[PDB]
Amino acid sequence: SHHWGYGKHNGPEHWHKDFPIAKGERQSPVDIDTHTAKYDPSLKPLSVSYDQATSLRILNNGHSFQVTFDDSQDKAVLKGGPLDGTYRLLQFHFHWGSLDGQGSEHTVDKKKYAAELHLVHWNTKYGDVDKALQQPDGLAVLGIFLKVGSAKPGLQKVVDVLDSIKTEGKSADFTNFDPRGLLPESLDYWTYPGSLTTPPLAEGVTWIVLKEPISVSSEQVLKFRKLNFNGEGEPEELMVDNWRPAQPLKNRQIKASFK
Ligand SMILES: CCOC(=O)c1cnc2c(NC(=S)NCc3ccc(S(N)(=O)=O)cc3)cnn2c1C
Ligand SMILES: [Zn+2]
DSSP states (O other): OOSOOSSTTTSTTTGGGTOGGGGSSSOSOOEEOTTTOEEOTTOOOEEEEOTTOOEEEEEEOSSOEEEEEOOSSSSSEEEETTOOSOEEEEEEEEEEOSSTTOOOSSEETTBOOSEEEEEEEEEGGGSSHHHHTTSTTSEEEEEEEEEESSOOGGGHHHHTTGGGGOSBTOEEEOOSOOGGGGOOSOOOEEEEEEOOSSTTOOSOEEEEEESSOEEEOHHHHHHHTTOBSSBTTSOOOBOOOOOOOOOOOOSOOOEESOO
């Protein structure tokens, strides 16, 4: 267990004491005001190249569940859009709510989605993720909203393994998972400079938030809500509402890839 969390005594309003950058100039997430975001005709097309992805493990880390990838070579990469050079996929994880009307970190005209998927990539010009974490352009997170409706077939393999990683520190083999199955049709996006949304809240992320949500079923998101923050044997505290709220935009502009 880590000291920080999402509760009354350790949640987002407390994080600044250990992580003073929590009150910084480029924190995430933010509200995306669709009427103030501006179309940027100079944004290059986004390239999501996930066909050679090598998934390794699925892990309950006490704040989310993550799927980890082999990032030792250019396998699954993000390029183009606002990005200079090549960003390698390291992991994905989710944020979700106790109810379908909350759970996302980003908001769209103050609308909260049921959940948000973060695909976390690092800039290969810095050689490893730890070095990338120290740079203002070290990371790129592709954010995808989840709404409750039809099931997402490409998520079901994830849902079906969550019973094996109920508590903090549990992991399982999770090879041959294809993250292409988590993507919506459209790659239309908003982009802005921001931060990690969990400690250490490092201000090194280029955010790329897709406009089109994916639909997941009520049964799929209910399985997320059966996970536990606690380790095996501690009082049961459901892993729900593991989202940081919108932070001040301050001196930033959100750009749109689309009209
Ligand atoms: C040299 C190879 O390094 C590693 O093996 C390594 C290092 N770190 C990780 C992570 N965790 C990461 S990168 N955490 C930082 C973070 C990111 C993204 C957001 S968000 N919520 O999207 O803003 C928050 C926080 C997950 N595997 N892994 C691995 C496998
Ligand atoms: Zn995240």
